[PDB]
């Protein structure tokens with residue numbers, strides 16, 4: 110009678126969360142954390158938004174029960190999510206073509222979609238950008254879906270390699286899923302232009318792909334409406350699509366696990382039938398979603414006063430990151446870098462895709478206490494006026 | 509192209525949550541909800557516990573960040589959970605043989621265990637009592653495991669058919685998983701005696717089963733410590749086991765999704781190896797767990813004044829249920845019931861397994877607006893002094 114657990118092989122360290130554990134153990138003073146994608150303020154803290162504290166006070170005073178939510182969550186949360194994604198007067202909403210489930214974070218939204226697709230459709234293959242968020246492959250693989258990669262990044266020109274993207278998707282077949290980052294591509298910070306989105310939408314329709322949009326950073330590139338332009342170009346042309354969205358980043362609600370999975374089908378009767386199977390997949394996973402974080406978001410989005418506060422707080426975050434992008438480039442020059450880092454100013458969202466080699470990233474960590482992901486992704490939102498100079502001195506030292 | 513969603517078949521309604529939806533839509537003022545397992549107070553509401561409101565006020569005023577929890581959640585939540593399960597000074601805890609992940613509810617803990625087993629071991633088969641919670645089969649099937657049923661309930665004598673149980677489980681092979689309800693069996697309310705638990709534990713080690721305890725009602729049978737005797741008898745003999753537990757019921761925290769999956773192995777090295785793969789399975793599901801509910805539970809359990817308030821609130825809930833069982837039995841006789849219902853007194857937890865037929869349950873709902881599950885399971889915790897009379901008049905009318 111040998112033990113059931115004896116033949117288990119240890120899992121590898123998560124490329125992002127294993128980094129964050131190393132950083133916590135490091136005892137060297139002055140260490141700098143440019144790893145995980147969270148927003149830091151000017152003092153290096155990860156604060157709760159004021160709009161969120163105000164919403165949480167309202168809930169504390171007014172909640173009378175913790176009775177279970179429905180499988181698909183708070184209804185108002187679903188409607189505000191759809192207006193945010195598709196626009197206040199979208200035909201998708203007027204025609205009742207979309208159904209939304211509240212999920213535990215953006216990850217949970219991706220997993221719900223993966224389980225739904227694997228069990229209820231003939232989808233066998235998901236295409237994701239190379240590079241992408243490392244956990245994408247794991248999520249779809251957990252449902253038994255094959256994941257293939259398409260080309261995306263021109264590391265020479267620090268731009269979208271649109272020609273290779275198109276050519277590498279040639280073998281994606283009708284009924285395959287193709288995953289797009291809605292904005293603030295993780296890790297490159299490089300998003301298609303409106304014209305490029307429009308070309309992709311047309312191509313997707315011709316080849317019969319099922320688009321799946323991952324929206325984790327709406328509002329961090331240019332603005333809430335502008336960041337949804339690519340999705341809305343797809344939505345104007347497609348009968349069917351799926352959107353996984355997260356409120357972790359744009360509400361600073363990381364650990365309350367607030368996200369949404371939105372299904373779009375050709376008509377109301379089809380999406381309702383499909384959605385009943387999405388609800389069945391949720392029920393066999395976590396039963397029904399956590400209320401606190403989604404209640405906060407729904408409270409903020411449906412109160413005009415609280416929403417105006419939140420939109421300003423999100424603008425402040427976006428602008429601080431853009432200021433740090435510019436200060437990073439300038440200080441690298443000041444500190445003696447001969448490599449041209451000006452492409453960082455053109456990149457969107459929390460990160461810059463710097464180009465450092467695995468070996469240089471390792472040197473930064475072991476020698477200077479500066480923590481980036483081994484792909485060379487750095488969280489610009491982790492840079493402050495106080496840590497910018499030592500950070501840049503370290504980078505110049507390993508170049 | 510023909511759409512990917514066009515041929516999806518609609519899912520059937522959930523036997524518990526579908527009933528709850530019918531109940532909400534029912535326009536009759538006298539309707540009575542005895543379906544889903546939630547606690548009502550004697551005024552018919554589903555309240556937030558006072559310990560919980562106090563903890564939530566502390567969190568509101570002292571939380572400074574929503575930064576991601578680790579994959580396995582709040583550390584003190586894990587330690588307090590192990591202490592509740594195994595006892596203040598257990599050898600499992602002192603030998604560092606146990607690891608706990610905070611999960612989204614008890615359901616989430618079951619799915620995490622199921623995914624972990626399916627993807628990392630040779631387990632193919634899970635054995636569940638007939639009857640059981642209906643969602644058990646769905647969770648394990650969705651992870652790819654086969655579900656087999658063992659006998660449990662003697663319907664003629666309203667008792668545990670221990671001989672039938674032992675005999676059906678002789679077909680369970682070594683390396684199979686056998687699922688036990690820790691206490692307050694759902695739906696029958698009939699638990700093993702301590703002697704019977706000891707017999708099963710011995711039989712379990714000799715046959716090589718991997719036990720999986722589902723603990724959703726610790727504290728509702730006799731007491732926090734007493735209700736864990738059966739699990740602690742298993743833990744004294746086995747090298748390996750899994751406990752999925754829930755704080756939904758005993759904290760009235762249903763919609764915040766607070767549960768735990770606890771892994772036990774033969775030694776510290778093996779459990780840390782196995783737990784690394786459990787974390788991988790979590791990372792590809794919801795990434796990390798929701799903070800608010802678990803923070804509430806950890807604040808209560810780690811503060812002596814709050815814990816004392818909570819333990820009294822749980823005692824009051826348990827005792828109110830016991831008063832309703834007796835009142836239910838006495839009132840049935842007063843309303844003209846032909847049959848002996850005294851076996852209801854011998855059942856533990858929120859429910860009673862009434863023995864009504866599906867056709868009688870259907871009549872109760874359609875003619876009398878009394879909502880019970882089609883199995884005849886009734887939620888005694890939904891009974892109040894004000895609804896007992898019409899409730900019992902309706903039951904007598906359909907006998």
Ligand SMILES: Cc1ncc(COP(=O)(O)O)c(C=O)c1O
Nearest residue numbers: 214215216242295325355357795
């Ligand atoms: C592209 C992308 N998708 C999904 C996620 C996961 O978001 P969440 O924390 O809400 O699960 C992230 C970041 O965490 C992300 O960058």
Ligand SMILES: Cc1ncc(COP(=O)(O)O)c(C=O)c1O
Nearest residue numbers: 396613614615641694724754756
């Ligand atoms: C035996 C059993 N296991 C698990 C659960 C699920 O607990 P939770 O709501 O926390 O997911 C329940 C009741 O809901 C239950 O009765």
